[PDB]
Design a protein around this ligand. Sequence first.
Ligand code: HEM
Ligand SMILES: CCCCCCCCCCCCCC(=O)O
Ligand SMILES: CCCCCCCCCCCCCC(=O)O
Ligand SMILES: CCCCCCCCCCCCCC(=O)O
Ligand SMILES: CCCCCCCCCCCCCC(=O)O
Ligand SMILES: CCCCCCCCCCCCCC(=O)O
Length: 583
Amino acid sequence: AHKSEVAHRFKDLGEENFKALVLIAFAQYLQQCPFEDHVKLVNEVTEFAKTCVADESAENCDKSLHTLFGDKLCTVATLRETYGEMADCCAKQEPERNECFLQHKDDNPNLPRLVRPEVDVMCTAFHDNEETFLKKYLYEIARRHPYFYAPELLFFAKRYKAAFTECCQAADKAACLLPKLDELRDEGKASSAKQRLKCASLQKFGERAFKAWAVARLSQRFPKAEFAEVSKLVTDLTKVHTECCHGDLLECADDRADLAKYICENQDSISSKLKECCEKPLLEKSHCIAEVENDEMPADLPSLAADFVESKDVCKNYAEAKDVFLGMFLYEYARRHPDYSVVLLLRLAKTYETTLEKCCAAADPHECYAKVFDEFKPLVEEPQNLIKQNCELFEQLGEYKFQNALLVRYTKKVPQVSTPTLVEVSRNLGKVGSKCCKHPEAKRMPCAEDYLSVVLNQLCVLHEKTPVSDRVTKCCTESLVNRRPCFSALEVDETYVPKEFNAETFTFHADICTLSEKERQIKKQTALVELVKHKPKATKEQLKAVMDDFAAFVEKCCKADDKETCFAEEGKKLVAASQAALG
Ligand code: HEM
Ligand SMILES: CCCCCCCCCCCCCC(=O)O
Ligand SMILES: CCCCCCCCCCCCCC(=O)O
Ligand SMILES: CCCCCCCCCCCCCC(=O)O
Ligand SMILES: CCCCCCCCCCCCCC(=O)O
Ligand SMILES: CCCCCCCCCCCCCC(=O)O
């Protein structure tokens, strides 16, 4: 509705947010134009918006947002010279014009990777002009990530602003700042990866699969909501997810805004944890509702045995509307289990489905599916035990040593993966342990699921078009519900031919003593991987012995008079003895 949509958007978003969003929008299309050009564009658009705010009847104010945005894009002088055929989109009637612009966004613009400046430099730039400093980076990230949901970039921005504001006036600027920048950076990459994984998953596995996932996730989140409400929400969420995957900012923003609005106007039928965020500005509503903690589930809910196993109408109810019945099963199981990963829940539903498909065709269905819940136990226990053993291992080893244990275990399983990748995945997996094991058992599986989906997705992306193992491909292309267990099922590669010994690979220098904590760990874990690759049959026990000799080697040589030679000569003996021990 509204006479002037731009005026309406300006009034609701507020000038500052409007300007930041217009900047992101333009940067995501004019990925090659300079920052100053974008600033000029934003000011021009904002000044126009203001005329509309002052008067909805002002000239051009009644044009749609897409029309106005596309027109502005087409007034860019160097459009054809810089963007080639994208300039051809201007010859199209708006509707088709927007689609054309959308399809011309470059998800890999081949721009130089952003590098973190020195703390003193960053902080000083921040101080000299926070606005420009922040907007400059907002522009650099946006143009490198067209498709990254614009509003979400605004949330990251405000978090960076806070990080710099607090850390740049602290006693130990770097100690304060860097960890925060590391976190933001990681969350950013993860969010981007997550956004792509979800759309890729929708594409490959279909809408039904997404709806199943949605029923489970929404049910854990809103356990007190009726199934019909959850069902309605899954339909709306599927639409938002599908349209947001199409990529148009406005269409996606309006869909999310619509859903958030519906949710907020129906809190009594959805959850008691939404008050604080249903009071938030339109811009932040959906984002905040998306992070709302699970509502508390209804007290002493009955077992599902009655309706899904004991009832005489099980097969009758199932056959009449299979997906609806399975959806009900999933909703009842999930609302009761916020402690399960969504995929575990999907494996339980699939198991139930398979049994009903088999049993309902039997002469006497009930006799056949009577013990279906028994089939659930082993499925639930697998992740549960895996988390127990890993958190127990982590608690007795520490993050670093924990990563190293994973490093050796995975290298042995897939020795063909590149060393840098084995190190990175192992380290990241070590962190998920450090992060999730800090949660009580009740919240560990969902945590692991969320973080592992990131780490494993990244591994899969790297393996994609850089494959080295059919088994990794299998796990990466299999159903997302069988992804993690598939990786867990990898066995030691016994066909792996030991990698020839490379002297250079096992030669260390005094510089190792001056590297940062991170750089040092990476050098050691890198050498550890190469060690396992060269001696794949070396037992974890034999490896520890060599690791201890090495540990004593670096320590009992980094701090020992003027010696840049106790690495060369003492290293020669270490390598010689190790080759013997592992021979
Ligand atoms: C305006 C606020 C900012 C936002 C919204 C933002 C957002 C992001 C996002 C979403 C990513 C990950 C993208 C990916 O998937 O690769 C990222 C990465 C990164 N950001 Fe920011 N950022 C902001 C400000 C800054 C600032 C002020 C700095 C440095 C002074 C910075 C330095 C970096 C670095 C070094 C990376 C890693 C790049 C890479 O590994 O290729 N960011 N940022
Ligand atoms: C609104 C109700 C939506 C119900 C969705 C059907 C549920 C299907 C459960 C079967 C699980 C399949 C798992 C998978 O897609 O990989
Ligand atoms: C050049 C025109 C720029 C128009 C500004 C784009 C509108 C931003 C919509 C952001 C609202 C997000 C709400 C949500 O996620 O629920
Ligand atoms: C670079 C390739 C690494 C391959 C290792 C498989 C991926 C890790 C399996 C997923 C983690 C499961 C949790 C665990 O460690 O028990
Ligand atoms: C690499 C260290 C991971 C530490 C956390 C334990 C992870 C155990 C796997 C849990 C998987 C949950 C999702 C699923 O149901 O498959
Ligand atoms: C061919 C023999 C090479 C012997 C040197 C092994 C180097 C591997 C370093 C292992 C790192 C262990 C972790 C640590 O001590 O911090």
